[PDB]
Design a protein around this ligand. Structure first.
Ligand SMILES: Cc1ncc(COP(=O)(O)O)c(C=O)c1O
Ligand SMILES: Cc1ncc(COP(=O)(O)O)c(C=O)c1O
Lengths: 389, 381
């Protein structure tokens, strides 16, 4: 159903018909405080007025670095990049270079950007251990040093380290899977990853492009009490300004895009991380928004006797209509979901003034602008939609 | 040198010192720093929604402006960086032709992606440009010397049937400024067209810089794909690749609304200034003449190549490639000169192969001041 945006503010889109739509997708993750956040955008505009890109060292560099180090426990030094994809590629090159090894371990459904060595077919994928290129025109050996396992399968993971631990440069992982449903790690799973990588000499890389500053102030790292060797950040960090980073403790960081680290980007980081740092109860409040939305949506689906799957970590949340007839991975979750009907539901909800992505595996990203009154409206819209389904 | 702020052609240091910048952040700032037309537009988009990940009215306006100004571009795909646009262009070529081999030229830089990142021995050696790349990263990548038609003809005679693409900075602007030898771009166009290989112009630097329609327009040779960035977005992070409909048969930030706004404001501005490239040419000429005079007056040999406002200046101890140019340059003394010029209030990059990028804010009076500063520097050398 065609939706062309004219403007956006808070949790609202205005389309080109001047229709207004409550947005549950929120641009895929960066907008913790909603669209058109003035504290952030005043700072970024100000930096445009004062020089946004000189390619030279700037006072802001040390401030953005210090705020990330402060809020993210496992980060002490950071290198900036222009995207998540770039930060991932650099982190993985660092791990290969640092360990003298080539193999990188991924999990099925986990998405780490479009770079040549990690771009796998995810949802478009056969078995979880098959490594299938995610785009046409990649070189034949693109993935020849990349391996894949099912998310939350400790036995396969132990087997792989027993066989090949000596060859593994890194394990990269969305600590909470947020690109193929929202699927938290099974209990002990992150700790097992940390133990196996530590024992083998492999670097553990948390891709926190989504989870960072979202599931807790210090990300999944802080929330689950497991510290990786490298952390990739983006999205919330810059408030939706294109910027990203990777970092780690000094030991891990011992060893390039021209836009990487430009002044407006770092200003956005300073304003966004500054704003978060000044709101010590922010994550308790986000948690309450998340809870209220989850309860509301559940009630509406239970009331229309439509089975639904909902996983939530804070304001990160997947909502999926189930077939008329706890998943630990993408295969298990996808097998339960009624994709066609969920698309139909999305069409209907959009007509009622609520936008979520039509693919039931694309999560919702709530913000402080999703107030109790906004959520009550979403409920009415969803109920009106379900009745029409 | 740590920057506090910048405006026009000026930097302010954390000591509140003022410095005329000849580097200008490596290419995007055709009108200088803090261009208010472009600022005002980008700030305005922040106030109205900078990223929803959804189709926006701006999408069609940015696309149309690029298709208007760049002859060989009819459809375009946006990206967050030059690196990403290059990677996508090359994947499109490999996929479209069913081939894998990509041809690059020594010294030519196309970003950091796995299949093109070469170290900037012989010009035909393909050396990885970063540690930690996979062993086969460059196994489908070949390299020739810039401006060597014989080697190029030999390669197509032997392997033309296997080549998915040739990628090229149509003017080399990452290793000196070394234009194509006369007829070289035409040869590339002919050899690629005959072999079924795609010709990819990396115009990240040259786009909207050496001419309104880029090197394509300036040299009258149209590639199958074009990569754009830098000037296109005014230094907002954004890039694109595109081509004719025939040839054209995403990073989450790719195509966000503030980026496309910056493109609309910048390309709109350039579209309104039909003599802009004539005026940039006059700035370039005046700088080149000025610098030549100062060096000749101190009897210091210097090499200067210029295409419009793109220009390399190198103290010496016509080169057609990097090897020939580097052999002539006195790198240590050029670094020393840079130190001295910086104390005099003029910044250029200390490596003599890093070019200068002039802007409409480098006025005649700015250039006269640069001349004084460079003379006071040379005398100190
Ligand atoms: C000719 C050329 N191509 C491609 C790129 C890559 O662009 P980015 O640094 O935005 O990835 C650059 C960067 O300077 C460049 O100068
Ligand atoms: C977990 C994760 N890692 C990496 C990326 C890549 O980020 P970018 O699109 O900025 O290259 C994404 C994009 O959504 C992501 O969700």
């Amino acid at each position: 159903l065609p939706l062309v945006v004219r403007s956006a503010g808070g949790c609202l889109l205005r389309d080109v018909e001047d229709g207004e739509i409550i947005d549950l997708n929120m641009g895929y993750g960066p907008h913790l405080f909603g669209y058109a956040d003035r504290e952030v955008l005043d700072a970024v505009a100000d930096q445009f007025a004062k020089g946004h890109m000189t390619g030279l060292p700037h006072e802001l560099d040390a401030r953005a670095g210090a705020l990330i180090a402060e809020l993210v426990p496992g980060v002490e030094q950071v290198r900036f990049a222009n995207s998540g994809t770039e930060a991932v590629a650099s982190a993985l090159r660092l791990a290969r270079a640092t360990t003298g090894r080539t193999l990188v371990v991924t999990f099925e459904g986990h998405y780490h950007g479009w770079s040549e060595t990690v771009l796998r077919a995810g949802k478009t994928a056969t078995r979880p251990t098959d490594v299938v290129p995610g785009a046409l025109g990649m070189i034949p050996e693109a993935l020849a040093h990349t391996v894949q396992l099912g998310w939350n399968d400790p036995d396969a993971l132990r087997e792989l380290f027993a066989r090949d631990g000596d060859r593994i440069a890194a394990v990269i992982v969305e600590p909470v899977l947020a690109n193929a449903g929202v699927i938290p790690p099974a209990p002990g799973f992150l700790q097992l990853l940390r133990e196996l990588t530590g024992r083998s000499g492999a670097m553990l890389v948390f891709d926190e492009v989504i989870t960072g500053f979202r599931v807790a102030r210090g990300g999944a790292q802080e929330r689950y009490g497991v510290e990786p060797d490298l952390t990739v950040l983006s999205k919330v960090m810059g408030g939706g300004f294109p910027v990203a980073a990777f970092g780690g403790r000094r030991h891990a960081m011992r060893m390039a895009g021209v836009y990487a680290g430009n002044h407006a980007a770092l200003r956005a980081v300073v304003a966004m991380l500054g704003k978060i740092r000044s709101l010590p109860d922010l994550y308790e409040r986000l948690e309450d928004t998340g809870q209220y939305m989850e309860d509301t949506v559940r009630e509406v689906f239970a009331t229309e006797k439509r089975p639904v799957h909902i996983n939530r970590v804070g304001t990160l949340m997947s909502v999926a209509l189930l077939k008329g007839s706890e998943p630990r991975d993408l295969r298990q979750l996808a097998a339960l979901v009624d994709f066609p009907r969920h698309r139909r539901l999305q069409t209907l909800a959009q007509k009622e003034g609520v936008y979520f992505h039509p693919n039931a595996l694309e999560p919702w990203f709530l913000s402080t602008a999703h107030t109790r009154d906004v959520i009550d409206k979403v409920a009415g819209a969803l109920q009106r939609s379900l009745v029409g389904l």
